[PDB]
Amino acid sequence: ISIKLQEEERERRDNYVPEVSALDQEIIEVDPDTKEMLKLLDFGSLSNLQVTQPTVGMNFKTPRG
Amino acid sequence: TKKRRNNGRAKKGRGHVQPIRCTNCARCVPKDKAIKKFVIRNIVEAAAVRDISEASVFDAYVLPKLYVKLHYCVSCVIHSKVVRNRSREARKDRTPPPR
Amino acid sequence: PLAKDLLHPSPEEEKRKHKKKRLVQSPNSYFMDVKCPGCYKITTVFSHAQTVVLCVGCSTVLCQPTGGKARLTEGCSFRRKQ
Amino acid sequence: MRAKWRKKRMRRLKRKRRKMRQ
Amino acid sequence: EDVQGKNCLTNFHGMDLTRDKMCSMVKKWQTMIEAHVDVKTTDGYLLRLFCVGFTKKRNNQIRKTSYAQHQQVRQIRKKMMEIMTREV
Amino acid sequence: SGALDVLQMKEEDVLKFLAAGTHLGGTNLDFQMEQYIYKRKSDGIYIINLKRTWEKLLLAARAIVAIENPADVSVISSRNTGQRAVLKFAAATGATPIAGRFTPGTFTNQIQAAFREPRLLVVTDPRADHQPLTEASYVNLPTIALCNTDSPLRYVDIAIPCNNKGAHSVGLMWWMLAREVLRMRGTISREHPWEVMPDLYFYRDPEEIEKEE
Amino acid sequence: GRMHAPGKGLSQSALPYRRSVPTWLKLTSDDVKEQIYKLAKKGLTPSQIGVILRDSHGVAQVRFVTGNKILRILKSKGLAPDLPEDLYHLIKKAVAVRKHLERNRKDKDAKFRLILIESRIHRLARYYKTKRVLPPNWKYESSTASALV
RNA sequence: UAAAGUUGCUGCAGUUAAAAAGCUCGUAGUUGGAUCU
RNA sequence: CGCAAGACGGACCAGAGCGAAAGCAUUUGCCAAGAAUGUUUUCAUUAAUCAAGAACGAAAGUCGGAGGUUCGAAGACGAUCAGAUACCGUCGUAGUUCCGACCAUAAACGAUGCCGACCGGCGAUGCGGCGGCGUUAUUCCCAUGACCCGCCGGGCAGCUUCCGGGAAACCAAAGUCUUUGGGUUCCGGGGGGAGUAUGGUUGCAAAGCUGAAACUUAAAGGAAUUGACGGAAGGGCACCACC
């Protein structure tokens, strides 16, 4: 069915917005490597981020076979 | 015409592979071309588990298993339906069936 | 990808290559001046040495041959040249 | 006829000819 | 070797692992190393001892196989034989 | 950006990108996406260079703007993650949306009911939207794509390097594209933040829909 | 690829572009020449002399310090060996293989390797005869070649 | 004779249509890296 | 429970390794050999391919000697069958095992000559080397192993791809081919006759290498497609199927 009223209903339902954006947060955890990326991007002076420590090891591959 | 890239065996990088005898017919088939099944079986069947467990002299005996490796030739493996023919595209799939 | 070009730096893509396959080939080895704490003079040792070299004033094993780079003994301070 | 059996037949023919031709 | 008073007195003759136990350890992506020694105790009991070991997959291993190189296997076999001889 | 202070990256944009995790790629790296990454992390995640992301977004916005009839640009999303974002982008910029299943032959079968002839194509993911990508190679249709680290670049003419797996990232990417297209056209202005905010473009689960009301 | 093997190895030395004497190296050309003379008198082949000078004395390349190659220096001083060291080592390997094959007659692999070694010997000897390094009547015979070793 | 690029120097083929020696070594033959105004 | 003999070396064992191929799997020792890697070592064109010539060459087979467990051509018997001379069963000779001579052939296959250059991507794996968080063992420093993450070089392969090719199957070579020329060896020319005859040569023999013609014939053949059929597999349906 391709009725116009269904499109109107869908577009009204999708027209939802909160008062606070989900991207509006005080603390953003950022890894040191992306911090270096920001610093080389002329954005190392931003105080909105927070140091999250890197992972202990490099165990990210799933076991083979 | 060639049906399989590996010719239905795993012989890559060597000339000769020692043969083994099929457990079903005693046919000489190469160890890489032979079709291998490793069965782990309870030595007591599911129906007989209750009787043997009740008649045991110990408590929680956990019955021993049986580890048998069967090597099949292609003919006996096909007749026994261990493996079966597949479509030309499904043939290339080496992923074992779920278990 | 745009070889021998200064616009995109590639020290890291050049010393990663095989030594013979570089734009201009160059060894991956070096000579190193070694001090032994018990000794008092320089010894210039090849990094991939194949000889069990001894101190020129003593009888101490400076390094041992391995498959690749030679293995130096403990305490001997080694510094690359050039 | 299988090729190897025809080859065997030809071998037997040659042997018989060698025997007869002394 | 003796029977006294309707009692048979036994003595050590040998030792083995059960068939299921030894079949259960032989898995297909590891090396199994076997050694054997003919060694005599201080009482004169000559014993043939067979030792078996298997290479262990590390807890963070991604590699499927845990094979030992031939010299590593020879060193392990040497250690096994030496320890068996020392203990007997 | 063209080395223009008016078109350069802002602090708010970088903060939004970091909050949405747009810089976070996958553990795999397509060899044609190498120039858009910064470095691999210790856990295998590739970091996407946000300056390159901004450059490619602005180039895509320029490509979209240089089409006078806005309905001649098609914005596609087969995945559920980008359907809402694509619909909002189409409403904002006047482009034509294809959210949901893209039936094959839409660009090639002139008899079909839904037959349309776009002048530009934008997709949410080359992998998921491979059908419109392949069809674009039949009607001389250039393509703009939101490409992750492991996205294939075949039939993609302008790739925007970004995280296209997360709902926040996809919504924010479409929101920035719409904002920049509108800014370049003449509508709205760069002297003040846009009234719309990215959460409207986001995809939300029905459970979250129920919870947040 | 290898002359007598299916190997396609690439491993070899990679000379640096600069042909100058290293700054660290303080040995005069004559000092390197006397060290070469001493090592030759010790009973070493030019390859061994070069290896020792590289490993211990820091002489990266003798040709770059003295302007001459080690074999040429040994010849000019008059203490170069009778036959070239590569041919000498090939003959030594052939002698070792023949000694092994005398007491191991069922080793067909050894016979095949001996054939390869003697083919290499003959090729090198023909090249040397072309360069007048060996006398034109020189021939490798496997009856008393152990004396040549 | 051309057609026959079905005798292929120009200019053919040789996994499955006819076809690469079981495999190496090896003399002749053939072919041979840069470099000197 | 012992003793003896002759074979064989399971599981581990893999699209893993080594070898020129054939081929190679219990421990340990001796003997000589070898690839790759490392190398700011040495020689300095010594090279590639190869008529002649030569080494090796599965199995079966031949001669002589030793041995002879198992299996087993031939053969005997029992079955099945219209018949079976075969499949199946019980035996069983040569042989299968080893030593010394012979033979030189296999679907000896990747049905794909060797050497060199260039032309995509990805994840693995084997060896060597290089670099690096962190985890374990040496119950102590460094090192060295076992892991983990990468890089480089050869290697066995795999997946993928509108590189390109091809009749296609399919092949990162079987590509860089009418936009045709990097070097070189062997070799094919419609199907049969026929790898036959004959000659030569090799062999104890069996036979191996070389190798026709008369004559006959319009196709034989390759790849793929659709059907039909299958004593091939997997499904579905009708109380003219069953329960």
d(CA F142, CA F135): 11
Both tokens of A3, joined, read: 């009725």
Q: Residues F194, F181: contact at Cβ < 8 Å?
A: no
Smallest CA-to-CA distance from F77 within F121, F120, F119 is with F121
Is F74 within a domain?
yes
A53: which DSSP letter? P
Smallest CA-to-CA distance from B40 within A10, E24, F17 is with E24
Q: Separation of CA E25 and C1' I84 in angstroms? A: 51
CATH number for the domain spanning C14: value is 2.20.25.100
Task: Find the closest chain B residue to E26 by CA distance.
Answer: B67
CATH class for the region spanning G81-149: mainly alpha
d(CA F149, CA F33): 6
Q: Residues F120, F141: contact at Cβ < 8 Å?
A: yes
Residues of the binding site of C for Zn(2+): 36, 39, 55, 58
Give the CB-side neighbour count of residue C16, counting CA atoms within 13 A.
Answer: 4
**What's the maximum distance between 2 C-alpha atoms anywhere in chain G?**
58
d(CA G87, CA G68): 22
| Domains identified in chain C, total number | 1
Q: Which residues of C touch G17 (CB under 8 A)?
A: 24-26
Smallest CA-to-CA distance from A41 within F10, B85, F29, B3 is with F10
**Number of inter-chain CB pairs under 8 A, A vs F:** 85
Distance from CA of A65 to the nearest CA of F (A): 19
Smallest CA-to-CA distance from B94 within B1, B18, B5 is with B5
How many CB atoms within 10 Å of residue G107? 14
Q: Residues B24, B82: contact at Cβ < 8 Å?
A: no
What are the angstrom distances between the C-alpha of G133 and each of A39, G85, G120, G123, G124?
Answer: 68, 12, 17, 14, 11
> What is the nearest nucleotide to G99, using C1' and CA?
I32
Q: Residues F17, F23: contact at Cβ < 8 Å?
A: yes
- Positive or negative torsion for Cα F163, F168, F174, F175: negative
Q: Which residues of G touch C19 (CB under 8 A)?
A: 14
d(CA E17, CA D1): 59
d(CA B54, CA B89): 52
| Length of chain G as a residue count | 149
Both tokens of C35, joined, read: 């001090």
E21 touches chain A (CB under 8 A): no
- Return chain G residues 41..100 having CB < 7 Å to nucleic acid strand H: none
Torsions phi, psi for C33 (to 5 deg): -80, 130
d(CA F191, CA E31): 71
Q: Residues F126, F147: contact at Cβ < 8 Å?
A: yes
In the 3-class helix/strand/coil scheme, how is chain B assigned residue by residue?
CCCCCCCCCCCCCCCCCCEEECCCCCCEEECCCCEEEEEEEECCCCCCHHHHHHHCCCCCCCCCEEEEEEEECHHHHHHCCCCCCCCCCHHHCCCCCCC
Contact A14 F49 (CB under 8 A): no
G23 touches chain C (CB under 8 A): yes
Task: Find the closest chain C residue to G14 by CA distance.
Answer: C27
The domain limits of chain B are 1-99
CA angle F87, F92, F94 (to 5 degrees): 85
Is F6 within a domain?
no
Residue A7 is which amino acid? Answer: E
Which nucleotides of strand I are protein-proximal, with an atom < 7 A from a CB? 2, 9, 11-29, 31-48, 54-57, 99-101, 110-112, 114-116, 121-135, 141-160, 162, 169-171, 174, 194-198, 206-207, 222-224, 232-234
What are the angstrom distances between the C-alpha of F208 and each of F35, F81, F212?
Answer: 37, 14, 6
Tell me the residue range of the domain where C6 lies.
Answer: 1-82
Residues of the binding site of C: 36, 39, 55, 58
d(CA G128, CA G125): 5
- The neighbours of chain C, by the rule of 3 or more Cβ pairs under 8 Å, are G
Question: Three-state SS for G89?
Answer: helix
Task: Find the closest chain E residue to A59 by CA distance.
Answer: E60
Q: Separation of CA G21 and C1' I37 in angstroms? A: 29
- E strands, chain F, in order: 37-40, 46-48, 73-77, 96-99, 120-123, 143-147, 158-161
E and F touch per CB criterion (3+ pairs under 8 A): no
d(CA G90, CA G149): 10
CB proximity G106–strand I (7 Å threshold): yes
Q: What is the resolution of this structure in A?
A: 2.7
d(CA D7, CA B98): 50
What's chain B's Rg over C-alpha atoms? Answer: 19
Contact A46 F11 (CB under 8 A): yes
* Bridge pairing between strands F73-77 and F120-123: parallel
How many CB atoms within 10 Å of residue E87? 8
d(CA G88, CA G90): 5
- Which residue among F199, F209, F212 sits closest to A21, beta carbon to beta carbon? F199
How many CB atoms within 10 Å of residue E32? 13
What are the angstrom distances between the C-alpha of G23 and each of C75, G20, G27?
Answer: 26, 9, 10
Which secondary structure element, helix H or strand E, spans residue C37, and what is its range? none
Q: Which residues of G touch C44 (CB under 8 A)?
A: 24-25, 57-58
What are the angstrom distances between the C-alpha of F26 and each of C19, E33, F43?
Answer: 32, 42, 10
CA angle E4, E5, E7 (to 5 degrees): 70
CATH of domain B1-99: 3.30.1740.20
How many CB atoms within 10 Å of residue F152? 17
Q: Separation of CA B10 and C1' I112 in angstroms? A: 19
CA angle G110, G113, G117 (to 5 degrees): 135
| Domains identified in chain F, total number | 1
CATH number for the domain spanning F100: value is 3.40.50.10490
Tell me the residue range of the domain where F118 lies.
Answer: 13-213
Contact C31 G60 (CB under 8 A): yes
Q: Which of B37, B61, B67 has the highest number of chain E CBs within 10 A, making it the mutation to test binding with E? A: B67
**Strands lying side by side in the sheet with F73-77:** F96-99, F73-77, F120-123, F143-147, F158-161
Task: Find the closest chain F residue to A56 by CA distance.
Answer: F42
Beta-carbon contacts of residue A53 (< 8 Å; ≥ 6 apart):
none
Distance from CA of A54 to the nearest CA of E (A): 18
E24 touches chain B (CB under 8 A): yes
What's chain F's Rg over C-alpha atoms? Answer: 17
Smallest CA-to-CA distance from F59 within F116, F135, F142 is with F142
Residue B21 is which amino acid? Answer: R
Residue C67 is which amino acid? Answer: G
| Length of chain D as a residue count | 22
Is F98 within a domain?
yes
